[PDB]
Design a binder for this molecule. Structure first.
Ligand SMILES: *[C@@H]1O[C@H](CO[C@H]2O[C@@H](C)[C@@H](O)[C@@H](O)[C@@H]2O)[C@@H](O[C@@H]2O[C@H](CO)[C@@H](O)[C@H](O)[C@H]2NC(C)=O)[C@H](O)[C@H]1NC(C)=O
Ligand SMILES: *[C@@H]1O[C@H](CO[C@H]2O[C@@H](C)[C@@H](O)[C@@H](O)[C@@H]2O)[C@@H](O[C@@H]2O[C@H](CO)[C@@H](O)[C@H](O)[C@H]2NC(C)=O)[C@H](O)[C@H]1NC(C)=O
Ligand SMILES: *[C@@H]1O[C@H](CO[C@H]2O[C@@H](C)[C@@H](O)[C@@H](O)[C@@H]2O)[C@@H](O[C@@H]2O[C@H](CO)[C@@H](O)[C@H](O)[C@H]2NC(C)=O)[C@H](O)[C@H]1NC(C)=O
Ligand SMILES: *[C@H]1O[C@H](CO[C@H]2O[C@@H](C)[C@@H](O)[C@@H](O)[C@@H]2O)[C@@H](O[C@@H]2O[C@H](CO)[C@@H](O)[C@H](O)[C@H]2NC(C)=O)[C@H](O)[C@H]1NC(C)=O
Ligand SMILES: *[C@H]1O[C@H](CO[C@H]2O[C@@H](C)[C@@H](O)[C@@H](O)[C@@H]2O)[C@@H](O[C@@H]2O[C@H](CO)[C@@H](O)[C@H](O)[C@H]2NC(C)=O)[C@H](O)[C@H]1NC(C)=O
Ligand SMILES: *[C@H]1O[C@H](CO[C@H]2O[C@@H](C)[C@@H](O)[C@@H](O)[C@@H]2O)[C@@H](O[C@@H]2O[C@H](CO)[C@@H](O)[C@H](O)[C@H]2NC(C)=O)[C@H](O)[C@H]1NC(C)=O
Ligand SMILES: *[C@@H]1O[C@H](CO)[C@@H](O)[C@H](O)[C@H]1NC(C)=O
Ligand SMILES: *[C@@H]1O[C@H](CO)[C@@H](O)[C@H](O)[C@H]1NC(C)=O
Ligand SMILES: *[C@@H]1O[C@H](CO)[C@@H](O)[C@H](O)[C@H]1NC(C)=O
Ligand SMILES: [Cl-]
Ligand SMILES: [Cl-]
Ligand SMILES: [Cl-]
Ligand SMILES: [Cl-]
Ligand SMILES: [Cl-]
Ligand SMILES: [Cl-]
Ligand SMILES: [K+]
Lengths: 263, 263, 263
């Protein structure tokens, strides 16, 4: 077949997909991967070394404009409860009615005013917690229980140049340009606070690669503590002040990690 | 009013009740009880002393014949899924559809053959775990976290004289006659194994009252360990062999204690 | 000599044997085995690695029908005290009168009714505790005191196809077919509960071989804890529910391990 005929048919090998569908991805082949990876992780069968893991504050928002009803990058995407419900059918298509109601139960008990954006925000958090944040935190817990140093970050700076609208917040993919040092180029109209943030992240990442320890040692920086089971310390990355916090998304992750897999 | 007019109307002060309805019971009166008792328990505001707490293996079965459809003391009460569902509506009348589906989800994932009695047993366990066993275990955990010795038992002997049918098992109320020593009377046709069981329970209860420690010290008995948070050791009471076990109904109680109150 | 003449004479090289006689077995040869193996075990002179060890609930019953008087696979084998006594002479032929009375003393203090099967059961337990269970537990204790992980199981499921009679219980040899996965073959008329039990044992054994840890990680299974001196946790294997228990046959093994060797 010509490549194009293959590419044209890939979307359709599945009876329904979502904005996050991975139709052709890694499998347990008995070669690269010798067993189901959740078993290897759980029983400590992996390279023993240091890791640096993290996520962005609004991981799930980018995906909402690729099919959730009522959402648009060109307006504030205020949706109703009915829209939120239709939105869960878009992101959880093979999932039982009970499963989808369990999501709604967990994410719509509001604190508290009748804010118009309640349902818009809840959907972005559903999608980002399920697909990115709770699995990164569980991976880091399980990895670190076998004795190696791990360091977790929560990236919470929205780029001053971001071409997507404000309601999408600190989107998935938009820490990358800070990691590779693009705001170090003054000619590019990032802010001064972003130059300093990128410079500090670049130093932490290079120190982690060179020395296994993602510190910034020269500029009275917050010290980045290892992430352990029990305390679960992580470091927030932002232009204002870096903080050590604990137990990121604790109540949400208990839902996705210990209950939802049963559904 | 004459007493009879009061008694006749008590059943009806509530728009629907269940076999377990307590229409007139303890309240927070600012006198006997100075605050909501869950607050006092949680914050350690109670008499500091030893406690002995326990439950019977089939606490919920006695209640099923007072209104769950398909149940009868005069047949084996095999029910269907539909009956099980109607049964939850009888025992959880003010509870949302989602709440009742959550019960069914948690109790009907079977291990495993298509046993006819699956749903009959699941209903007795729902009712006994929610109303008796998980709350006794939570009370004992919370009490013991403030530093006092607590001892938990699981009573699992069905009286040889029990006039209710076999499917009801080790029913609610039927440890009482062992505690008060009725099987010590040989004229009454309990078995010899029941005489010995009652004699040992009577000694443990009297030792607990006299000395704060419910041991039977003279007859090479299993030593009854204190119940602590963390290990949650309890002692099984039966005619065959007494065992030390841990974490009674762990998976079920996590459901009733940490999830169900939200529903 | 022709092989047959050798085989014909093997039974007779010993002045009396028992159903468990090993007339030609391992010896201390100064080659395969460099010293008495109890010395090597006691002083830690063995390969340092993980072990998985376990026993079946009724190890000794299979042997009773190969010579104990009153026993038969074709009836319920209720025996008398005199039969029990003759039975000890069959299984402990070189042992002093005092030694045999010590066995009877330890196993016949009954709890408690005058059950007809008291002596039948006591004999199966004598033979299974002395020959299999207490030595497996002592081996596992002594091995694990030198620092390696060990996991102990107690197998308590009687195969639905077992052609021996009910009184023999969970016999010696009858876990093997669960380990090798024979109940996975639906065409063979094991029950559904046995298919699931075998599937779980097969996974635990393969995980132990591959990873040194006999967990079943995917199906909310009971976690199998290491067996340590002090706590002596073991895992029960059955079709109903898997339990973590402690100190298997504690009172019996103290008899066989610390007293009987003196006799
Ligand atoms: C924000 O936009 C969405 C997206 O749809 C629209 O894009 C707009 C910016 C505008 O150009 C509009 O014409 C275009 O259709 C609106 O949702 C849509 O609403 C329409 C019209 O009512 C529905 O019939 C559509 O099915 C629905 N589209 C999708 C993909 O759901 C949305 O209402 C609007 N929200 C606002 C203004 O708050
Ligand atoms: C076990 O009994 C129940 C209870 O109802 C019955 O009590 C029986 C022992 C017998 O005397 C019967 O006539 C009496 O009604 C049975 O459930 C009942 O089934 C009937 C007839 O089909 C229904 O129409 C009833 O509504 C229902 N009663 C209740 C309270 O649910 C039940 O089927 C039976 N179960 C068995 C035999 O397994
Ligand atoms: C259960 O059987 C044993 C075994 O002996 C017998 O096998 C039976 C099923 C039957 O065919 C019987 O004829 C055969 O001998 C019984 O013990 C035997 O009892 C006999 C007759 O009284 C004694 O004289 C034998 O020596 C004795 N055999 C052995 C090996 O001990 C046994 O009594 C019987 N038990 C029951 C029925 O409870
Ligand atoms: C994988 O197997 C079938 C494949 O069915 C598919 O045919 C393909 C060539 C492709 O075009 C694909 O879109 C189409 O779905 C799946 O069967 C589907 O199941 C649905 C019900 O959900 C039925 O309606 C059809 O048989 C078929 N779908 C449609 C839209 O026609 C099957 O679901 C799948 N296996 C999985 C998901 O595990
Ligand atoms: C307590 O207040 C009312 C009381 O309504 C009741 O009138 C009583 C005298 C008594 O007979 C009782 O059985 C009757 O219910 C409750 O109002 C009920 O709510 C339902 C809907 O669930 C309506 O149908 C009625 O107003 C009434 N019930 C019936 C069966 O007619 C109210 O529910 C209750 N408060 C609670 C439960 O907190
Ligand atoms: C090993 O040495 C002798 C061997 O005596 C045996 O002669 C063999 C060829 C064989 O047939 C065997 O069955 C026979 O016993 C043992 O001597 C026995 O001791 C008993 C008393 O218990 C005497 O009666 C005999 O000398 C002989 N037995 C019989 C039945 O005739 C000796 O016991 C043994 N050593 C051990 C057990 O350590
Ligand atoms: C540290 O501070 C200096 C000057 O005070 C600055 O120029 C540099 O960017 C900082 N370095 C890092 C690694 O953040
Ligand atoms: C202890 O055992 C004796 C005799 O061995 C018995 O009569 C008595 O009932 C037992 N006592 C208790 C307190 O269980
Ligand atoms: C786990 O459960 C699945 C389905 O719920 C079942 O088919 C499989 O046999 C189980 N696996 C193991 C290893 O026990
Ligand atoms: Cl709704
Ligand atoms: Cl904390
Ligand atoms: Cl249904
Ligand atoms: Cl435990
Ligand atoms: Cl005697
Ligand atoms: Cl113990
Ligand atoms: K739930």
């Amino acid at each position: 077949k010509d490549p194009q005929e293959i590419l044209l048919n890939e979307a359709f090998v599945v009876p329904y997909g979502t904005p996050l569908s991975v139709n052709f991805g890694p499998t347990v082949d008995g070669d690269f991967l010798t067993d189901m990876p959740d078993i290897l992780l759980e029983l400590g069968q992996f390279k023993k070394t240091q890791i640096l893991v993290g996520v962005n504050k609004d991981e799930g928002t980018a995906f909402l404009v690729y099919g959730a009803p009522g959402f648009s990058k060109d307006n504030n995407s205020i949706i109703t409860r009915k829209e939120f419900q239709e939105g869960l059918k878009i992101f959880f298509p093979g999932v039982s009615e009970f499963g989808k109601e369990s999501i709604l139960f967990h994410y719509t008990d509001w604190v508290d005013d009748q804010r118009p954006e309640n349902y818009r925000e809840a959907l972005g958090d559903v999608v980002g917690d399920y697909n990115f944040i709770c699995p990164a935190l569980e991976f880091t817990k399980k990895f670190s229980e076998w004795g190696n140093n791990a360091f977790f970050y929560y990236f919470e700076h929205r780029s001053s140049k971001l071409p997507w609208p404000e309601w999408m917040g600190v989107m998935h993919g938009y820490e990358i340009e800070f990691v590779f040092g693009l705001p170090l180029e003054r000619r590019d109209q990032y802010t001064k606070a972003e130059e300093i943030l990128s410079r500090s992240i670049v130093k932490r990442w290079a120190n982690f690669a060179k020395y296994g320890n993602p510190q910034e040692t020269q500029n009275q920086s917050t010290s980045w503590p290892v992430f352990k089971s029990t305390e679960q310390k992580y470091l927030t990355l932002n232009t204002e002040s870096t903080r050590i916090m604990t137990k990121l998304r604790a109540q949400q992750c208990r839902f996705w990690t210990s209950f939802f897999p049963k559904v």
